[PDB]
Amino acid sequence: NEQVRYAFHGALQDLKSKPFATFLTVMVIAISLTLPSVCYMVYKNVNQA
Amino acid sequence: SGLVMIRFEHVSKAYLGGRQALQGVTFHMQPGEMAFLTGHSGAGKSTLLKLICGIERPSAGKIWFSGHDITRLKNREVPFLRRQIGMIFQDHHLLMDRTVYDNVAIPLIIAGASGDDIRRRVSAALDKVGLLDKAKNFPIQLSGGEQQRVGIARAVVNKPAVLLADEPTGNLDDALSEGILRLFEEFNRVGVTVLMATHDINLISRRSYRMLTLSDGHLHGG
Amino acid sequence: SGLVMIRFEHVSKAYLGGRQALQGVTFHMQPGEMAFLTGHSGAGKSTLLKLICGIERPSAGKIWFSGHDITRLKNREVPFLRRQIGMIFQDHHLLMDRTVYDNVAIPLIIAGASGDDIRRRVSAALDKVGLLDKAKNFPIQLSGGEQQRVGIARAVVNKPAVLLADEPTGNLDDALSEGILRLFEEFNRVGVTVLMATHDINLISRRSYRMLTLSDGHLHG
Amino acid sequence: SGLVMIRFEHVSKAYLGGRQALQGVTFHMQPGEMAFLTGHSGAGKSTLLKLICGIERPSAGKIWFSGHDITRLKNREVPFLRRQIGMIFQDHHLLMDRTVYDNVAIPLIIAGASGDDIRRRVSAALDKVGLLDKAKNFPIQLSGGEQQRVGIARAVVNKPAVLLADEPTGNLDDALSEGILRLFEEFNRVGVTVLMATHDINLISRRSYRMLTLSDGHLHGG
Amino acid sequence: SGLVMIRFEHVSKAYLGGRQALQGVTFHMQPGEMAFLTGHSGAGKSTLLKLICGIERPSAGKIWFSGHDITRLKNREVPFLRRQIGMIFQDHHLLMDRTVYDNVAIPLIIAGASGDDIRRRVSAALDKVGLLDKAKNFPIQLSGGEQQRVGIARAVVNKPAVLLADEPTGNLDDALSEGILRLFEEFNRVGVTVLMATHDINLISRRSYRMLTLSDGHLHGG
Amino acid sequence: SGLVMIRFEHVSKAYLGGRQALQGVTFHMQPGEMAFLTGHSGAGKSTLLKLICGIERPSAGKIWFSGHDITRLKNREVPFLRRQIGMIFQDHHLLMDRTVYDNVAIPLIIAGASGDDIRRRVSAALDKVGLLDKAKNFPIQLSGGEQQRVGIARAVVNKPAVLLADEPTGNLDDALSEGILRLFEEFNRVGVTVLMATHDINLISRRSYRMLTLSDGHLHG
Amino acid sequence: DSINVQKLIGATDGFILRPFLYGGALLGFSGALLSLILSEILVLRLSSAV
Ligand SMILES: Nc1ncnc2c1ncn2[C@@H]1O[C@H](COP(=O)(O)OP(=O)(O)OP(O)(O)=S)[C@@H](O)[C@H]1O
C-alpha cells in the first residue's frame, strides 16, 4: 500500500519537473476537446430551438 | 555439499553473433564464500556475472541460485531473483540528478517498505560504508572513490544474499582499492557471498581467497 | 622555447561546490612531446584534461592551445578547438546503434568532407589501429579491446594536433594495455602530442616519458 | 588416486662433482593437471624436468611416468618415453638452416608417418599456435616471440601426453609471455598435463594453478 | 588431526582502551607447517604472535601450544613456554654492548648448559645462518642484514619448536629478504613450524605456503 | 645556482672499524626540492642522512647546510643545526609515558616558547597530520599508523627548513605509505625540502621526483 | 536511467508501469477539465454576441 504513494509523488514531481512542456501539453490537450465540446453545445441548443 | 548458493553445471553462452562467451563453466559457491573471478579481457567474466543476476540466459547447461534452478527462470520471477543479488560495476550507476539519500533508498522502495523503515536502514547502510553525514549531497559533488562507496551502499541495502562486483575499483587508486576490498570483506564476514571479478594483481595477491581464472570462456584451472 | 602546444599558467578550478579541483598548475608541452599525467583519485587529472578541450573553463590563470589563448574562448569558437584534439576516455563513447564505419567517420563529416574523401581517410584510420575488415560490423560484436581501438581510430581521424587520453586501458588487460600504448607511440612519432593520464604502474614504468604528477590539484613538483 | 602421470618417490640427483641437485623430491601429477615449478636459480628446476624425459637418471628414489617405472629405464626404451613428452626450453632449439614446415614436421618423421599424414597434422599444429601461412619461411626471419611459437608447435605435434616447459618466455616480453601461457592452457584443456617451470612473478600470480617451489633441491612447501 | 602445535578457538584480545585487536580468531597449525600471516597495519598480526609466546593473554577463547592449554598459563610456567618458541622481530633486539658469541649464547645460559656444550651449539647455529668467523665481532660493526642473521641464530639456538617471525626483513633489501626467507625454509625442513608475519608482496607470492590474512582482527578468509 | 640548502663535496665516512660507509658522495639540493634516497642495505643511506643532522661527522669532504659549512661544526653549535631539520625515522621515537600533546610540543619548548604560543602551533601541527582530537591520548592507544603521524607532527613543529625521513612507512601498510607520502608533499609545497630515504618500489615509481641511488657508498651516477 | 536502475535492482514490471499510468490518467483528467472550463467560458462569451 505504501507503493502507491511514491507513485503519486513521482508522477506529480515529474509533471512539475518541466512546467513549460507540461503546460504546453495540457493546453494542446485542452484545445483538442474544446471544439468537440462547443460543437456539442451548438448541437443541443439548435436541437432545443 | 550443503546448499550451494551459486552453481553452474555445463553453462555456455553463445551470442547472436555466433561467438562463444563461455564454454562448459562448472563451479559452485558455498553460502559465505569469497572468491575472485580473474581472467583476460575477452574472457566471459562479466558474462558469468550476468547469468547469475538473470540479466542473460545461458545457451546450455543449468544455473542454480540458492536452491532454485534459474536456467529458464520465468520473466515474472526475475525481479525477485535480483533482489537477493547486490550488483557493483566498474563505474557507479548513480542517478546524478537526485540526492544520495534517495539514490541509496531505491531498493527498499522497490521491495516496498515503510517510510520510517527506509530511514533506519539507509542510515545504517550509509554508516557501514562510512558515508553518513553525506546523505544530503548529490553524487556529482562527491569525490571519485566516494561515488563508488554509495554504489556499494545501495547494493548492501535490503541485505542481499550475494554481492557481484564487476571489476570495481577499476577507475580507483590503489590506496582506495584496498579500502573498498576491506569493505567487501566486512560484508562477507556476516553471511553474504562475494564474487568480485577483477583485474588487479596486487589486490588478489594480498588475500587468500578462491580465485576463478576464466580463459576464453573456460573457467577454472586451479 | 618555440611554440608550446599546451601551456598552463597559475591555474585553478573551483567547482560550484566551492572545492579546489586544481591549484596553481603550471607547465608547457612541446609539439611532439609525450607525457604521462598521474595522480590519485581526488587529483584533478580529468579536470586538467577537460580545460584543454574547452569542456570546462578555468577559475583563474591562463591556458594556451598552440599559439592562441583559450582561457575565455567564446562559445562560438569552441567547436574548432576540439577538432584538433583527440579525446580517448576510459569507457569508449561509441554509438551503439551505428556501424563502426559510420562510428569512425563522424569527425570527418563534422568538418565537412567528400564521400570519396571520407572513404579514404576512415579506411586508413581503421588500418592504423589494425581494425580493418571490421568496419561493417557493429561495435557490440567486437571484443572489449577492439571497441576501444575504434575509439582511438575516431580520435585520430582529421589528424589532431594533440591526443588526450583519460585513463584508457582502465578496463583492459595488461597485455592489451601495452598494445594500446604502442598505438599511441605510433602517433606520437609523426606530429601529435600525447597527454596520457593513467593510474597504471607497469605501463608508465617501462617508458622514459615525462611524468606529470598531480597531488590534490598541485602539478608535478 | 587414479593413474598418476608423473610421480617421484624419494628422488635425489647427485652429480659427478658430488653436489646435490635434488634431495627427497616427492610429488605426483594427475593426467590433466597444470602446475608451475618455481624456485631460485640454483634449485633443481631444470634438473627435475630432465629426469622426467629420461635425459638424466636419478641417484636415488624412483620415477613413475604414466603407469611405468622409468628409474632405470633401458636405453632401448628411452626414445619411446620422450615421444610422449613435449619439451620447450627457454630458447628455441630450432634448426635455423631448414624451413619451419620441416622443422615442425620432425617428430612425425621420427615416429614414422605417411607423407600425407604429415601434411595434415603439421598444418593443424601450425594453426593452433596461430602460425599458419608461416610454414614456408625460415626460423631466422621470424620475430623473437614467433620462433618460440614454433617450438611449442613442434612439441604439440604427435599429441604428447605431457608438455615440460623449461622457463619458456624467459627472453620474451610480458605481453608475449601471457600469450604463450594462454597457449599452454589451450592444450591443458583437452587432455595433456603441463609442468611449466618459470621465474615470472606476474605470470603465476594471475593463475590459480598448483605451484611447486623448489629450494636447494627440496620440492614442495605449500 | 594429530597434535596441532598451535591452535586458537575463539580467541579475542581487547585492550585496556576498549578496542578490539582480535575477534574470533580460529585456526590450527600442524607440527612442521610453514605459514604466512599477512594483513593491513591495524590488524592484530603482532598481537596474534604475542599470544602464542605468552607475552599477552587472550580476553576470550583458548590457545593450545603443543598439547597444553596456555589460555591462563601460570606465571611460573611462562618462561618454559617461550623456551620452545623462537622470536624474530622487524628489528634485532641484539645487545650491542656485548660480543655476538655471547649475544647468541644467551638462550643456552638461560636453560642451563655446560660451558663446552654452549661452545658446540652456538658454533653450529652461527654456521647454519652462515655467520661463523663473525662470533668475535660486536653487533654494531656488522652490516644491517647481518645483525638480523644473528637474531635468527639466537632464536634457532636450543632447537625451538616454533619460530615466530614478526615482520622480519622489514628494513632489509629485497635481495636480502629472499635470503632470510630461504633461511627460514631451511629450519622448516627438519621439524619446526614457522609463522612468519609479513607485509612483503613479492616474498609470499613466490612461495606456495599457507597464508593467514588478518583484517580488523578477523583471521582467515581463504 | 642559488643557495643550495644541502651540498656535499667529495665526502667519505669510515667508521672505527676501518670500513667505508660513504665514498665520494657529491650532490646539491635546492630549497624546495623533494628527492628520494634509495639503495641496498649496505649502502650508507642513513649515514648520509646522519651527516646532515650533525649526528656523525664526515671523515673527508665538506658539507654545507643552507649557506653555512658544518663539516667541523663545534659541539656548541650543533643543537641549532638540528632545529631546522625534521627527523622522521622508520620506528617512531615517541615518548611512551607522555601524552601526544606533550609529545609533539617538545620541539617548541626546546627553542623556548610561550604557553599560548605552544598551544597554537601544536594544535595546528596536529591538524595538518589530521590527528587532532587525539592529543589527550597516549601514544600506546593509537594505531601503528598514527604513532608515526605524530612523529611527522613533531618534526614539522618549529617549521624546519628540511625534512629528513629515514625509511618511514617501513612498518606501514601500502595504503598507509601513500598517505604518509601525501603528507610530505603537503609540506614540500610550501618551503621545506624533503630527502625521503626508502626501500619502497611502488611508492617512488608513482612520482617524478629526483632519485639519489647509493651503491656501496657511491651516490647517484 | 532511473528505469534501467530500477529494473536492475529488481523492480517489477508493474512498479515501472505506475508513475506513468497515474501521470497519463491525471494528465487526461486535467486536460478534459481545463478544456471543458475553457469551452464553457467561450460559449458564455459568445453569448454576448448572441
Ligand atoms: N562537476 C563537478 N562538481 C563538483 N566537484 C567536481 C566536479 N567534477 C569534479 N569534481 C571534483 O574535482 C576533484 C577532481 O575531479 P577529477 O578531475 O574527476 O579527478 P579524477 O578523479 O582524477 O578524474 P578522473 O578519475 O580521470 S574522471 C574531485 O574532488 C571531484 O569531486
Ligand SMILES: Nc1ncnc2c1ncn2[C@@H]1O[C@H](COP(=O)(O)OP(=O)(O)OP(O)(O)=S)[C@@H](O)[C@H]1O
Ligand atoms: N552483447 C554482446 N554481443 C556479442 N558479443 C558479446 C556481447 N557481450 C559480450 N560479447 C562477447 O563476449 C566475450 C566475453 O564477454 P565479456 O562480458 O565482454 O567479457 P569481459 O570483457 O571480460 O567482461 P568485462 O565487462 O570486461 S568485466 C567477448 O568476446 C565479447 O566480445
Ligand SMILES: Nc1ncnc2c1ncn2[C@@H]1O[C@H](COP(=O)(O)OP(=O)(O)OP(O)(O)=S)[C@@H](O)[C@H]1O
Ligand atoms: N652437468 C652438471 N654437472 C654438475 N652440476 C650440475 C650440472 N647441471 C646442473 N648442476 C648443478 O645442479 C644444481 C641445480 O641444477 P640446475 O638444472 O642448474 O637448476 P636450475 O639452474 O634452476 O635450472 P635452470 O636451467 O636454471 S631452469 C646447481 O647447483 C647446478 O650447478
Ligand SMILES: Nc1ncnc2c1ncn2[C@@H]1O[C@H](COP(=O)(O)OP(=O)(O)OP(O)(O)=S)[C@@H](O)[C@H]1O
Ligand atoms: N657505528 C657504526 N660502526 C661501524 N660500522 C657502521 C656503523 N654505522 C654504520 N656502519 C656501517 O656502515 C654501512 C652503512 O650503514 P648505514 O648507513 O646504516 O646503511 P643503511 O643500512 O642503508 O642505513 P639504514 O638501513 O637506513 S638504518 C654498513 O656497512 C654498516 O655496517
Ligand SMILES: Nc1ncnc2c1ncn2[C@@H]1O[C@H](COP(=O)(O)OP(=O)(O)OP(O)(O)=S)[C@@H](O)[C@H]1O
Ligand atoms: N598496548 C596496546 N594498547 C592498546 N592498543 C594496542 C596496544 N597494542 C596494540 N594495540 C592496538 O591493537 C591493534 C592491532 O595490534 P597491533 O599489534 O598493533 O597490530 P599490528 O600493527 O598489525 O602488528 P605489527 O606490530 O604492525 S607487525 C591496533 O588497533 C593497535 O592500536
